[model samples]
Target chain A: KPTITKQELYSLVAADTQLNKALIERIFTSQQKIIQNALKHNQEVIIPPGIKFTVVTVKAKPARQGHNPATGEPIQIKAKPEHKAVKIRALKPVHDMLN
Target chain B: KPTITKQELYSLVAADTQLNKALIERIFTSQQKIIQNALKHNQEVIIPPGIKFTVVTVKAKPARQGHNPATGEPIQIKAKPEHKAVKIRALKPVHDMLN
Candidate 1:
């Protein structure tokens, strides 16, 4: 997974020759819902094209054989939820895109 | 990527014994904003815990080799942008979670 921001997104859209204003808006709405819900629950949520969902959860585990970043000394990190992963079944449009 | 809905989100949120209504609302709102903006620009936008972004674009090109599935004959397909990717940096909480 990677990280990005809204302002940067504005530029990307502006640059796209293919994507138009309307498609951008629709995609944004769905994406927004997913991010919002995930943080709210400290779990993962999926954003769909029209309407749908997949569960994403943060998975954390203990650090193995590592030194702490700050101290460079031996440390242990416990396993727990840490990131969001998504699972979405094929929608008609999505299916078409793939096949 | 996973897809989910507002109603389903509400339910997932409700299912969470840990999350509260207020947090849910906040997360939903931000998520919504990101989704809305992405669709508007027709480009990829990033939703930060507060604010940040990365560039995501649909990648398409001519399909290489092989017969068309329907006809089982030689065919050509063009590649095009069709997917979104997210890139977010460390928020205090997210960073902490990783550690």
Candidate 2:
């Protein structure tokens, strides 16, 4: 099971020193969405041919920590099983980006 | 030039509070990139036809807050001229989203 690591992503953005934090985050999000959408149709994103990316068929995990901004009070956050997953096949671009 | 405000954007994502920070940031970033690309290609993104959306064609400005991570030392940030601009036409959907 290949999992996307935040550290690797952070480094990717860091490499582009000129890129803004918002911009870097957007790149990650866009990639995620593209994968998610592709999985919905049972379509795969071939990072390279022979490697397939598919959704893991899971539900969304609920978030914890509903903090009150005004009072700084922490509220219990509910978890929901509606999150989905997308998996990627190892390819040159994917490997290059991560490494 | 009418600048895009972070606050207004924050609100847009707040409405879809179900979305995580990364996802919301991605949306904003994608929009920015599309606009940027359009401007580079001399293609205008017409928010409305009557109104013309054009790039301001400004030099990119330097970024602030280039601090040393290891020591957390405050460093002076230099200004640069390299940023391009894109303008939007005042359209109904634009108003609807902002409002």
Candidate 3:
């Protein structure tokens, strides 16, 4: 899987818009900051026409009995503490274009 | 489940950075365009210190027989075509702050 480096993306946008990389970088950082703030407050941040970021809170999972796959021995599955997750989804317009 | 609108986010960033909304909006739009282009080419886009967007390709699900939950009757599940998806995950630093 080829990954796009931050530098590469920045360069591309900067070149396309005839703008400086520093300015572009500043905008991206601020955008991230705002999104982080929204998630921190349990709100979803929607970027028009394509992306939405949501903070999902997963409750603690109660301890349960489970079996070892190979030995078929009973095992205690420990409870997991609550955790938060950020989910990003691409809307249908973007999905259709790419898929 | 409150959502943070685009305007709200833009305003927040504008206030924080003391930048005009129009400039902020252009930067955001350009950032999105670059990210979309990267994803269109099947490259993973990483936003440093927190977020990563990856395109996931799911294969076609073949037709299968499944039982109805209540009626216990066999049902045919039609095949589904392959599709591409974008997966976004928050990194540990951000996850810890929110969770």
Candidate 4:
């Protein structure tokens, strides 16, 4: 909810390092592709100090038959579809702080 | 839990981008410092398509005095300390996919 934006970080990085803003952008452009490809292939990616990109796979399950209690009629429980989810977690070292 | 390493990502980026591995690492080193500074200042940073680094702050609560039922003795409740946490989340576009 803060006012900071992605550009802010890129600018700061440019100022702090010999790498300029354009180079920074270009690097991240390639970085995104790398992460995108990895996630698509169900692979995991660790970005430097503490970001992690993980693929979570849920196998498909078959449907089931059941009787409805209210109607006393047969019902079909739909099969669960397989899915891929990319989960992200920041390393504790990246965030742990107190004052 | 995947076998992929940060070096793997760096090499992939180097191959795909005009920038080299050393430059990629340099960019990330600066990226880390920028992010670290932002997190330290309780700011939020969005990386490319969908990664967000957010700072979660919890304010400290003062201790309260309460009476115990067993012997009508006074008990002191400890105060809660303030803390800062950096939460990382990948944007949906970065992770959304299916076949």
Q: Give each candidate's fraction of reference contacts reproduced.
A: 0.17, 0.00, 0.60, 0.65
The superposed Cα distance between candidate 2 and the true structure at residue A55, in angstroms, equals 45
Top DockQ prediction, candidate number: 3
Q: Once superposed on the true structure, which residue ranges of model 4 sit more than 4 Å away at CA?
A: A58-80, A96-99, B58-82, B97-99
Q: How accurate is candidate 3 locally (lDDT)?
A: 0.74
Tens digit of per-residue lDDT, candidate 4, span B43-92? 77777656877777678989999998989999999998886657777666
lDDT per residue for candidate 2 within A11-95, as digits (tens), equals 4334544455565554444444443344566554432111345445666777787778899988986787765454433334222
Residues B1-99 of candidate 2 have per-residue lDDT tens digits of 121133333443434354555555554444444434445666654311112345556777767887799998999878877654444333342222211
Clash pairs (backbone) in predicted model 2: A59-A83, A60-A82, A60-A83, A62-A79, B59-B82, B59-B83, B60-B81, B60-B82, B60-B83, B62-B80
Q: What are the clashing pairs of model 3? A: none
True contacts kept of 2: 0.00
Q: By descending lDDT, how would the candidates be arranged?
A: 4, 3, 1, 2
lDDT of 3 at B85: 74
What is the RMSD of candidate 3?
A: 4.8
After superposition, the stretches of candidate 2 with alpha carbons farther than 4 Å from their true spots are A1-99, B1-8, B15-17, B47-52, B55-85, B93-99
Candidate 1 chain B, which ten residues in sequence have the lowest lDDT sum?
Answer: B90-99
Q: Which digits, one per residue and each the tens of the lDDT, describe model 3 over residues B7-99?
A: 777887787778888877876677677777888888888664356777888899999999989999999999989877777666675566464
Assess each model's interface with DockQ, reporting 2 decimals per model: 0.11, 0.02, 0.44, 0.37
Show where candidate 1 strays beyond 4 Å: A1-99, B1-31, B38-53, B58-60, B67-72, B81-92
Worst 10 residues of 2 chain B by lDDT: B90-99
